[PDB]
């Protein structure tokens, strides 16, 4: 009934600078329609990589679901946006989030074909798993934890070996 | 000893009347064609003190009414000449395992697209929204048609699993209503995501539509036969073709069919069942009244296959063929307004695709 509409059109329609002071002026970032639709879910699914960053960085809800079970990285999946798919991944953008179908952004990527899609989708996955481990290792103070994470981030391909670490200094670290 | 027709304003009705005067001049008998508006009201009204035309045309919803006030005499055509037409449409005619009309043209919505925006339209519905994606691009739209009426809507609902009542017996199915099913639920969701990822309007009606394909705004429109004129004035180079599918199944339209029953209360029963069969339902008759203005599709097959040569027309037949006969029944009413609330509600985001159908059965 104000400025969250005029922020969903120029989200729809792509007006970066309209969205931008919209903004400036006080919008609900995550505005919503009658259907749970986010600007961040129409500039997604409609190809605006700028819209997508700046309502990002002003604290749009990365993995918000609209009414029908939608999420901003199953509608940038659909039609190959790289870009926005890498800046949500960016901001906390859910792998594992099921739409109405019971479907991930990546099984929709390999759906539509986009290799180079489902690539970045699959190696987010397993990185964040990776990540995901170090941090629920019981065995491990919070200084051991960034001495992990951190080499996680260093040699991404080391990894699985990293992994490997991690459990057997938690298995060593204890009461066996 | 004459015949006097009744058949709607918007008919063939002066070449009807050329068939009439070849009865005359092979039997004596003057035949008189007339076209009161509202006839359809007039007929049963002046039918149950025993008057009006001996021979009645009208959409075949209308029949079941009329037979059920006993204003419909049985018709006896013999196998033969019940071959000479689609058995389908034997079934828009059939009333208590009577036939009581015979069936004259088929009606059914078609795909409608724009040749130049989209020489090869989309065999699914699936298609669609990577369509429009392209389109708006440009400033076009793939897609727009009547979102308000269920008559509209309702071949995609229908696809998957939908059904008005299911035709057990010969007659109606008055028990299953299907709007509450899981084939109905992924026809509206479907139609719903349309709408919420902004393929298409919520309010987008009939009028809307129809300016915007007629000016070359969207590549798409979903209509019937009776459209074909504003298109054809509009220069809009258009084809019409088969129904996309949805989930592999083919979208499902109602069907009407032009009938023509004789009254009840008529002496002429006989010379009446002589004008339908052997005048009217021969290649001349039809040609006689699709000259005047256009029956579309036809019931009789010989006349069906040359009208066919028009692509139009095929695509009415086929999409025809694939739909389901617009049940002839009363609560046909009481299914439409919950159809018609079901879809403005889901379409509107007012309740969900699920609680919207379950809802319109109670």
């Known amino acids: ?176 | 000893g004459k015949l006097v027709i009744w058949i709607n304003g918007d008919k063939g009705y002066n070449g009807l009347a050329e068939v009439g005067k070849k009865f005359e001049k092979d039997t004596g008998i003057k035949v008189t064609v007339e076209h009161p508006d509202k006839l359809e009201e007039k007929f049963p009204q002046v039918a149950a003190t025993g008057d009006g035309p001996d021979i009645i045309f009208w959409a075949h919803d209308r029949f079941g009414g009329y037979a059920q006030s006993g204003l419909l005499a049985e018709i006896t055509p013999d196998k033969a000449f019940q071959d000479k037409l689609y058995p389908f449409t034997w079934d828009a005619v059939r009333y208590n395992g009577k036939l009581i009309a015979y069936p004259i043209a088929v009606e059914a919505l078609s795909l409608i697209y724009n040749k130049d925006l989209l020489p090869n339209p989309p065999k699914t519905w699936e298609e669609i929204p990577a369509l429009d994606k392209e389109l708006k691009a440009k400033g076009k739209s793939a897609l727009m048609f009547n979102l308000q009426e269920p008559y509209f809507t309702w071949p995609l609902i229908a696809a998957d699993g939908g059904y008005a009542f299911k035709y057990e017996n010969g007659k109606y199915d008055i028990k299953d209503v299907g709007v509450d099913n899981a084939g109905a639920k992924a026809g509206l969701t479907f139609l719903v995501d349309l709408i919420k990822n902004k393929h298409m309007n919520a309010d987008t009606d009939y009028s809307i539509a129809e300016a915007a394909f007629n000016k070359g705004e969207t590549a798409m429109t979903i209509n019937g036969p009776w459209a074909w004129s504003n298109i054809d004035t509009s220069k809009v180079n258009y084809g019409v073709t088969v129904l996309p599918t949805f989930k592999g199944q083919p979208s499902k339209p109602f069907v009407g069919v032009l009938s023509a029953g004789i009254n009840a209360a008529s002496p002429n029963k006989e010379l009446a069942k002589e004008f339908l069969e052997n005048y009217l339902l021969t290649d001349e008759g039809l040609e006689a009244v699709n000259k005047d203005k256009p029956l579309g599709a036809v019931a009789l097959k010989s006349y069906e296959e040359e009208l066919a040569k028009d692509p139009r027309i095929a695509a009415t037949m086929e999409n025809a063929q694939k739909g389901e006969i617009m049940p002839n029944i009363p609560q046909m009413s009481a299914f439409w307004y919950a159809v018609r609330t079901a879809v403005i509600n889901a379409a509107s985001g007012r309740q969900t695709v699920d609680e919207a159908l379950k809802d319109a059965q109670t």
Not at chain 1, 40 to 49: D, I, N, T
Not at chain 1, 79 to 84: K, M, N, Q, T, V
Not at chain 1, 124 to 143: M, S, T
Request: one cysteine or more; hydrophobic letters at 45%.
């Open chain 1, 1 to 176: 009934s104000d400025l969250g509409k005029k922020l969903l059109e120029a989200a729809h329609a792509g007006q970066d600078d309209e969205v931008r002071i919209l903004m400036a002026n006080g919008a609900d970032v995550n505005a919503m329609d009658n259907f749970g639709v986010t600007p961040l879910h129409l500039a997604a699914y409609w190809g605006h990589f700028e819209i997508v960053e700046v309502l990002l960085k002003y604290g749009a809800d990365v993995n918000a679901s609209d009414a029908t079970g939608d999420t901003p990285l199953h509608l940038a999946a659909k039609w190959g946006y790289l870009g926005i798919v890498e800046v949500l991944l960016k901001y906390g953008a859910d792998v594992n989030a099921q739409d109405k179908f019971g479907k991930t952004a990546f099984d929709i990527s390999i759906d539509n074909g986009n290799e180079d899609l489902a690539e970045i989708l699959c190696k987010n996955k397993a990185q964040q798993a990776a990540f995901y481990c170090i941090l629920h290792l019981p065995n491990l103070n919070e200084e051991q934890r960034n001495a992990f994470i951190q080499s996680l981030k260093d040699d991404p391909s080391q990894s699985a070996n990293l992994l490997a670490e991690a459990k057997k200094l938690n298995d060593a670290q204890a009461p066996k």
